[PDB]
Amino acid sequence: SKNGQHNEIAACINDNLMAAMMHNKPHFVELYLGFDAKIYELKPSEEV
C-alpha cells in the first residue's frame, strides 16, 4: 500500500477472505477489512 499498488490486492483479498473464512482465522479477517475488503463480492469454490 505504501508503494502504490492496489489492483493486485483487490484481486487477491476476496479469495483471501474466502479461504480465511474457510480455514477459521479471525485476525486475518480483522486485518483484511479496512483495506477495501468488499464482503459482498465473495465467490465460492464450486458451482451450484
Partner: protein, 239 residues
Amino acid sequence: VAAKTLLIENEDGKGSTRMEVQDFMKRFHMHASEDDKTGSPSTAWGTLRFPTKEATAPYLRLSVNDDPEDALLFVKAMLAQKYGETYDRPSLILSVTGGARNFTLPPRLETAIAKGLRLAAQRTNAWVVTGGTNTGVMKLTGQIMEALSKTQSHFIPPTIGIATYGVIIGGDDMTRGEPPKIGLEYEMHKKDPPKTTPLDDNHNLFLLVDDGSTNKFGKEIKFRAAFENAAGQAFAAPV
C-alpha cells in the same frame, strides 16, 4: 420577518450601537470589472437557503482591498444578532486548506484524517475556515461538520467559506435583487456559462472576495490569512 438592525461591537470595549441594515454595509465594496480599482459599493449580502438544510447561511461579497476586521465585525455582529451578546467565544481558529478538484485519496487514510479532524473539531469547539466550494477536502470537512452539527448543543460553531467571487455559479442570481436578499434560494444544479463550481451547503457563512476577474483563481488568499490573523488577535486564540 427580517432583522433590520445589527448589534456590532466597538473596537476597544464591549459592544457598540445597533446600526441599521442600510447602515454599516458601505465599507464592503465590489468590482464591476477588472479594470476598476476603487470600485462600487457591493449591495450583495444576506442569507442563502440550500436544499435539504433546515437552517440558512449568511453570505457577503467583499472587495480584495477591503478591511478583514470589518468582515470579522460582520461575523461578530451576526453571532450577536443570532445567539445574543452572551455567545461562546472561540479558543481555536482551525483553518483547513487543500486541493479542490485534484483530491484523490485511499479510503483508509481518508477515514483516518476524518476521524482525527472529527475528534479535533469535537474536543476543540473551533471555528473552521475552509474554501467555500463543494469539491474535495472542503466537501469532506463540510461532511465532518455536518456529522458533528446534528447534536451541536446550543452554540453551533460557524464554518466560514471564503471563496473568490466570479467562480461561483449562483453568484449572478445572488447579486441581482434587493440588498438584504434574505430569502435567496441557491441552485446547485444551475448551469451558468463562464463558471463551473458551486458552493457547499454545509458551510455556515460565506465570504466572496471580488477582484473583478472571472474564472481566475487565487484572489481569496491574503484576505483569508489576514482575516484569520485578525480573529487570532481579536479573540486571543491560536490559528
